[PDB]
Amino acid sequence: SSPVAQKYDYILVGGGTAACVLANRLSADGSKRVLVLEAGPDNTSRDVKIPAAITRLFRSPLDWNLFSELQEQLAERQIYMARGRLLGGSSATNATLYHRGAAGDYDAWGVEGWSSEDVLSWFVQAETNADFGPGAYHGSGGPMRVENPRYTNKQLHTAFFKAAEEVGLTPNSDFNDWSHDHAGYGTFQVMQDKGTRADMYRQYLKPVLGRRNLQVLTGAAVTKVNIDQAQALGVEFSTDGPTGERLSAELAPGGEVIMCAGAVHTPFLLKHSGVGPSAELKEFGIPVVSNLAGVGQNLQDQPACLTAAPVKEKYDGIAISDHIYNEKGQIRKRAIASYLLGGRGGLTSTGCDRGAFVRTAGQALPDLQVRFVPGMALDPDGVSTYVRFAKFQSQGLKWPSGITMQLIACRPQSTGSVGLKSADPFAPPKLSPGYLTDKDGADLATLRKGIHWARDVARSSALSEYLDGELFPGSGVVSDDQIDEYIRRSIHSSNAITGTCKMGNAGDSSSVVDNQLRVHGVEGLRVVDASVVPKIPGGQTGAPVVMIAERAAALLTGKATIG
Ligand SMILES: Cc1cc2nc3c(=O)[nH]c(=O)nc-3n(C[C@H](O)[C@H](O)[C@H](O)COP(=O)(O)OP(=O)(O)OC[C@H]3O[C@@H](n4cnc5c(N)ncnc54)[C@H](O)[C@@H]3O)c2cc1C
């Protein structure tokens, strides 16, 4: 009752990160009626705008509340895998960290037309950096806002840098500069506009919500893509939910359907739509339009574990938790006041924006990403501690002061999968992260060796002055087996998730899309989001998504060509 006898030049499934970019650039003439269907609501939550309230988006209405299948290798647990559920997608719920990884990450893709020399200009074109001048690696005129974090914990952040220096790391002054090596300790830039989250809704969709050729439907959950037998022809959605009406939205002659539901829900929606490994599709009774074996497969996420330690009594009150809560658990008015009048203070932080990239075994690129938090975890799952921190508000308790080190396998070797669990298009997908299953034990050894590195750092003079004990894993965890066990029980997602509809050269029987993001054997169906990432780059994945979406956009409208 919303696309009523209206034929669209481009239909966008999902109003996420890449989708926001695409609507902007495709709606930019006047000739292309673009539609955007977003399951979740509009972007208006204050908890999304204030970076520190990331703590309140986890397991919230605005998250998809996805949970993995049982992971036998991880002590038979389910793994919460947070995903944003609103316009802008996970850019509105993410940690705001700005990482491109290294140039080799892209060269390793092997795909023609998408080497590091091909991607670098599309990063720079999307960026306005408050803290680096315009150059080969940084932009000044692009829609994204990037800045150095406007919080500093004067005492713990400096001691982390002194500690890292003590154990032999050297600094890196820009982890996104491909003229020097990726490893090093340093400060991560953040996707923030003076301490407000600068999500892709705010930076791209909001400035164009008035173009008459641009129609944005929130609350609109797509259930399949119409493919008349091969050619996509529309989508089906429901404006209320599982128990509503099954509307349809037709395309114009020449109109394409761009998948933008993310590396979780896109390979899910495609499988419901007829594109996937047939042996899986037959089992639920879905005809096969295209039998591509790579849909669902190659899921790549970056696992994390953590260490935490309290600070000595004499340093009580110098943690970021002390800057956000008072001894009774109410938000400090000084922290509110510095945020609102100046865009400074604890509220601007997601807490994890200083750290390191480390080679644990002389790998070619860093296998380990460290995120240092000047606050103390109280649960060894880091995602839970943030949930816990939110609910800790006004309980009358005092969150103890300490530090945390989150360790991340940033170029992991284990692959996962996204599959069908029900015929119900409103059912949760079958999701298996598959961390720690690479045949060589290499991801587990990255993290185990990360733990030893984090204790060396904590044991340095620089940090031992402040620290007093270790709470996680703790004194009882000495042996490697004991470390490996703790990893298996506390391992959590650093929240990347790429590769489920990966692109590849012609003749790649494993690839789902081609170097122009068109899925094989279907007409007018493209995929532009984190699924197409053939090999996950070293770091958080928001930025490479934006790049991919800019590139795909300028390709569609004939401003650039690939290969
Ligand atoms: C908690 C968290 C922290 C992160 N931190 C960082 C970080 O600090 N820096 C960084 O660079 N990256 C970070 N990431 C990753 C980054 O946010 C994502 O990889 C990136 O935003 C993915 O973009 P996308 O367009 O592929 O997906 P999304 O932005 O998730 O877009 C997919 C969209 O599809 C919608 N959708 C799903 N199913 C349907 C359906 N049936 N019908 C309609 N719409 C549907 C979803 O609601 C969503 O809006 C983080 C991720 C999370 C979850």
Numbering used by the authors: 77 to 305, 310 to 643
What does the report in the manuscript say about this coordinate set?
Fatty-acid photodecarboxylase (FAP), together with protochlorophyllide oxidoreductase and DNA photolyases, is a member of the rare class of photoenzymes that require light to initiate each catalytic event. Absorption of a blue-light photon by the flavin adenine dinucleotide (FAD) cofactor within FAP triggers the decarboxylation of the fatty-acid substrate, which leads to the formation of a hydrocarbon molecule and CO2. The recently published high-resolution (1.8 Å) structure of FAP, determined from cryo-crystallo­graphic synchrotron data combined with UV–Vis absorbance spectra, revealed a bent oxidized FAD in the dark state. Forward electron transfer from the fatty-acid substrate to the photoexcited FAD occurs in 300 ps and is accompanied by concomitant decarboxylation of the latter, as shown by time-resolved visible and infrared (IR) absorption spectroscopies, respectively.
Here, we extend the study of Sorigué et al. by carrying out the refinement of intermediate-state structures against extrapolated structure factors at 20 ps, 900 ps, 300 ns and 2 µs. In order to model the structural changes that had occurred at the different time points, structure-factor extrapolation was carried out using Xtrapol8, which estimates the structure-factor amplitudes F ext that would have been measured for each pump–probe data set if the photo-triggered intermediate were present in the crystals at 100% occupancy (equation 1). The occupancy of intermediate states was determined to be between 25% and 35% for the four time delays.
